Amino acid sequence: IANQFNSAIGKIQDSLSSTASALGKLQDVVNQNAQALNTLVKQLSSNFGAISSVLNDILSRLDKVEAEVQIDRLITGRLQSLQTYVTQQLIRAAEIRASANLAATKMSECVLGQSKRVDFCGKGYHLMSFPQSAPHGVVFLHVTYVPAQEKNFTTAPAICHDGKAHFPREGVFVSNGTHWFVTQRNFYEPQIITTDNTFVSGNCDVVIGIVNNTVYDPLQPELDSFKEELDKYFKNHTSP
Amino acid sequence: VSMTKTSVDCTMYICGDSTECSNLLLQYGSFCTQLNRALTGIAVEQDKNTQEVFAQVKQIYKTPPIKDFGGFNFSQILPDPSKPSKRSFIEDLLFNKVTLADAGFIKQYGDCLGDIAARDLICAQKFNGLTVLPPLLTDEMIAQYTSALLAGTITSGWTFGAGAALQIPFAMQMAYRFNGIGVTQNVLYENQKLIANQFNSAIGKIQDSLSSTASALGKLQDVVNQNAQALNTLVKQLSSNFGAISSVLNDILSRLDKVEAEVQIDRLITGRLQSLQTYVTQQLIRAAEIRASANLAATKMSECVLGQSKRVDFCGKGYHLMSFPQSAPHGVVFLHVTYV
Amino acid sequence: TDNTFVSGNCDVVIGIVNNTVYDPLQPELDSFKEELDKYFKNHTSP
Amino acid sequence: SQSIIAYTMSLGAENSVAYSNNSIAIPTNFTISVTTEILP
C-alpha cells in the first residue's frame, strides 16, 4: 500500500512535468480576465460616430459647441463599454464563487475528513486527500482504494444448518465451487462459516435462494475436548 | 441540465441586408464580436453540462438476456429495442410531455416558405440571424448513457462507480442497501416478494402519473418557454422605431440620402445593439441557473445512482435505497427508491 | 449477552430498569452439568 | 497521408456484465490510485 501510494505520487510529478494542458481550468480563468481587459482597451479605438476615437483630436479641432456633440458620443459608447465589462465580470465572479465554495467544501470534506459521498473525491473509495496551491486555484490529490483483481464466486443470501437460516453479520457468503465461506464485501479474504461470522433469523422455508451448509460452533470442540477430559477422569477413576 | 444553444449573427440582426448600416456598426467595434463570444461560451457549456451529468461511465454496460432480478420488474425503465431510439417506456412518456422548439435539425425552404412561412415564429427568428444549434449528444446518445448507468446499477450495485462493474444478485444488492439504512438484511429476504411487489407497484404509479397529469415536467418546459420567449422578444424588438422615421432599415434608405439616413440608421443601431446586450446578459444569467442545476444533477447522478446516499432528503423523502436515471428533453429525471 | 454490552454499575444511568439478561453459554453448560451428574450417578452403581 | 476525418462519436467501450441470480465478483487485490482535481 505504501509502494502503491509512492508510485501513484510519482505519476503526479511525471504527468505535471509531461503534459502542457493539465491546469487548463486555471489558465482559462487567467485567459478570460486578460481577454476582457484587452477588449476593454481596444474599445477606446471605437469612434461611436465621432470625428475621431481620440478625445484630444476633437478638442484640437472643435470649439465648445461642436466638441460637446462629438464628446457625448465617446462618453455614451465608452460608458456602455464599461457597463458591458462590469456586467460580464459580475457574472464571471459568480462562476468563480461557485467554484470557490466547491473548493472550500472539498477542503472540509476530503482534506479535513473522509468522504462517503461517491465520486466526490475522484473515482474509487475515498481514503484521504492532500491540498496543493496553484495560481488562483487549489489542486487536490485525492487518494482512493480501487478494487482491481476480481474472481467470480457462487453465492447465497443465507445458509440452512439446523432448520434455521443464517445470514452474515458483516460480509457475504461465497463458494469456491465445493466449500462455503464468509468474506468481507470489498476484498476477498475467506473465513469458515462460524456462529461468530453469522446471525440466525427464522426457519429455512421463507428465504428465496437459500442453501445448505454446516455452520461451525466455536464453543462445540471447546466443550467436546472438555468431554474427553471428563471421560478420561472417569476412565482413570474406574481403576482404584 | 441544458438549454437551447443559440448563435446570433448580430451583423444580420442589426444591419439586415444593408452595407450602409454595416459600415456604421463597425464604428462600435468589438460589440458585434463580444456578443458572439458570450453566446459561444454559453453554447459550448451546454455540451459540458450534458457530459458532466450523463457521461459518468466510460463503458456502456448492457443488461443480460435473462431478467431474474429476484422479482423486481425494471422492464418500464430499461431500453425498448422495438423503437427507432433505444429509450425506455418511462423515457418515451417524458419525451412526449415537453414540446421542444427548433432543435437545430436542418431547415430546407419547403418547411419555411409558402404555407409554413406564415404560421411560424422560428422562421421570423432564423430570417433575422437568430439560429438554434444542435446539442453534441443526441437524444439517442443520452439514452445509451442512461441505459449504461441503469444496467450498471441493477447488475452491479455501487461497484461500477468505484471500479470495474462486479456482478451481484439483485436481492443480494438490495440486502446491502437495507444494511445501509440500518435495517438488517434478513428483513429483505423474509419480505422479498412484498418488497418486489411494492417496487413494481410504485413504478406503476410513475407510468400512471406521467400519463395522467399535464404539469409533471413543469421545470423543463419552463426552461424551453424562457428561451423561446427570449428569442421571440428579440425578434419583436426589430419593430421598435427608437425615434427613427421607420423600424424598417430599407424604408429609410428608400427615402433618405447618405446625410439624413446616417441620423436615422444610428438610432436603429443604438436600439438594436442595446436589445442584443440585454438578451445576451439575460442569457448569461440564465446559463448560470442551468449550470447550477446541471452540477446538482451531476452530483445526484454520482451520489444517488452510482451510490447510496446517507444525506437526508437528497434523493426524495425516506431512507435512500437506490435511484434510476431517465433522460428527458434538456433534463434528467431520477426515480429515487426509498424505504419509508 | 450477545445483543448487549455492559458498562458500570446500576446507580449512574438515569431511567434504567430491572430485567434478566439471558446468557447463551449458561444452559449450554447446565446441560453439561446434567451430563456430568448422570455420569456420576451411573458410576455409583459398580 | 494525414486527412481530416468526420465520424459518429463512441460513447464508451460496450460491456455485458456477467450477471446471474447466484454469482458475485469479489476483488482479490486493489490499486491505490492518486488523482489530481483542479478548481479555480
Ligand SMILES: *[C@@H]1O[C@H](CO)[C@@H](O[C@@H]2O[C@H](CO)[C@@H](O[C@H]3O[C@H](CO)[C@@H](O)[C@H](O)[C@@H]3O)[C@H](O)[C@H]2NC(C)=O)[C@H](O)[C@H]1NC(C)=O
Ligand atoms: C475450496 O477451499 C477449500 C478450503 O481451502 C479447499 O479445501 C482444502 O484443501 C486442502 C488441500 O488442497 C486441504 O489441506 C489438507 O489436505 C490433506 C487432507 O488429508 C492433508 O494431507 C494436508 O496436510 C492438509 O491438512 C484443506 O484441509 C481443505 N479444507 C477443507 C475445509 O476441506 C478446497 O480444495 C477448495 N476447492 C476448490 C475447488 O478450490
Ligand SMILES: *[C@@H]1O[C@H](CO)[C@@H](O[C@@H]2O[C@H](CO)[C@@H](O[C@H]3O[C@H](CO)[C@@H](O)[C@H](O)[C@@H]3O)[C@H](O)[C@H]2NC(C)=O)[C@H](O)[C@H]1NC(C)=O
Ligand atoms: C414486468 O412488467 C411488464 C409490464 O407490466 C410485463 O409485461 C406485460 O406482460 C403482459 C402479459 O404478457 C402483456 O399483456 C398483453 O399481452 C399480449 C400483447 O400482445 C395480449 O395478447 C394480452 O391481451 C395483453 O394485452 C403486457 O402488454 C406486457 N406489457 C409490456 C409493457 O410489455 C412483464 O410481464 C413483467 N415481467 C414479469 C416477469 O412479470
Ligand SMILES: *[C@@H]1O[C@H](CO)[C@@H](O[C@@H]2O[C@H](CO)[C@@H](O[C@H]3O[C@H](CO)[C@@H](O)[C@H](O)[C@@H]3O)[C@H](O)[C@H]2NC(C)=O)[C@H](O)[C@H]1NC(C)=O
Ligand atoms: C405490510 O404491508 C403490506 C402492504 O403494504 C402487506 O401486504 C398486504 O397484505 C394484505 C393482507 O394482509 C393483502 O390484502 C389482500 O389479500 C388477499 C388478496 O391477495 C385478499 O383476501 C384481501 O381481501 C386483500 O385484497 C395485500 O394485497 C398485501 N399487499 C402487498 C403489496 O403485498 C403485508 O402483509 C404487511 N406485513 C405485515 C407484517 O404487516
Ligand SMILES: *[C@@H]1O[C@H](CO)[C@@H](O)[C@H](O)[C@H]1NC(C)=O
Ligand atoms: C436462478 O436461475 C435459474 C435459471 O437460470 C433458476 O432455475 C433458479 O431457480 C434460480 N434460482 C433462484 C434462487 O432464483
Ligand SMILES: *[C@@H]1O[C@H](CO)[C@@H](O)[C@H](O)[C@H]1NC(C)=O
Ligand atoms: C490417575 O489417577 C492417579 C491417582 O489415583 C494419578 O496418580 C495418575 O497420574 C492419574 N493418571 C491419569 C492418566 O489421569
Ligand SMILES: *[C@@H]1O[C@H](CO)[C@@H](O)[C@H](O)[C@H]1NC(C)=O
Ligand atoms: C418520567 O416522567 C415521570 C412523570 O411523567 C416521572 O415521574 C418519572 O420519574 C420520569 N422518569 C425519568 C427516568 O425521568
Ligand SMILES: *[C@@H]1O[C@H](CO)[C@@H](O)[C@H](O)[C@H]1NC(C)=O
Ligand atoms: C452406565 O455404564 C454402563 C457401563 O458400566 C453402560 O453399559 C451403561 O449404558 C451406562 N448407562 C448410562 C445411563 O450411562
